[PDB]
Amino acid sequence: IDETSSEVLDELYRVSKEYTHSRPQAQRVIKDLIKVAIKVAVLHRNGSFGPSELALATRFRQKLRQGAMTALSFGEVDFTFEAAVLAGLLTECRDVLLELVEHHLTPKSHGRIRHVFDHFSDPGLLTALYGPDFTQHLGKICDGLRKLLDEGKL
């Protein structure tokens, strides 16, 4: 696994664990995240996607970059964090991914996608993340996101 991606994944785990107060819950969401990513990766490697699905994958990446850039913008003291906006963007990502894998992955895998995106798009979690107690976590996530965008890994 890519080192920067691992660093961000680590931070997402830590944010989830601290927000929920549950190691088992955080481990579960990150396990599902990893499973989903790899399953989608395999579909890309095996040439399983049709033309409309490949266009959907392109849209998903655009949306994911938009989410990342918006997360970064809200990190600026200048601009006011709006949880509903970031949550809405993450839900747009969820929905594009769900469409992408509708005909390729099992309903169980669709459930894992909903679990991951619904966990992190939770306005409660995001509000905590952008609040006074999560300053260090947010900085590290933003550093990672900026590096991923810079290196073309999103």
Least Cβ distance, residue 61 to Cl ion (angstroms)? 17
CA-CA distance, 133 to 32, in Å (whole number)? 26
The piece of 19-27, 48-56, 67-75, 104-112 that touches Cl ion (CB under 5 A) is 48-56
Residue number, 9 or 43, with CB nearest to Cl ion = 43
Which residue from 23, 27, 42, 50 is in contact with Cl ion, where contact means CB under 5 A? 50
CA-CA distance, 119 to 124, in Å (whole number)? 10
53 binds Cl ion (CB under 5 A): yes
Instruction: Find the helix packing angle between 83-101 and 23-45, rounded to 10°.
Output: 50
- Triad 133, 136, 142: Cα angle to 5°: 120
What single-letter amino acid sits at 67? G
Least Cβ distance, residue 52 to Cl ion (angstroms)? 4
Residue number, 50 or 123, with CB nearest to Cl ion = 50
Residue length, the chain? 154
CA-CA distance, 149 to 154, in Å (whole number)? 6
Which residue from 22, 52, 106, 136 is in contact with Cl ion, where contact means CB under 5 A? 52
123 binds Cl ion (CB under 5 A): no
Q: Enumerate binding residues for Cl ion (CB under 5 A).
A: 50, 52-53
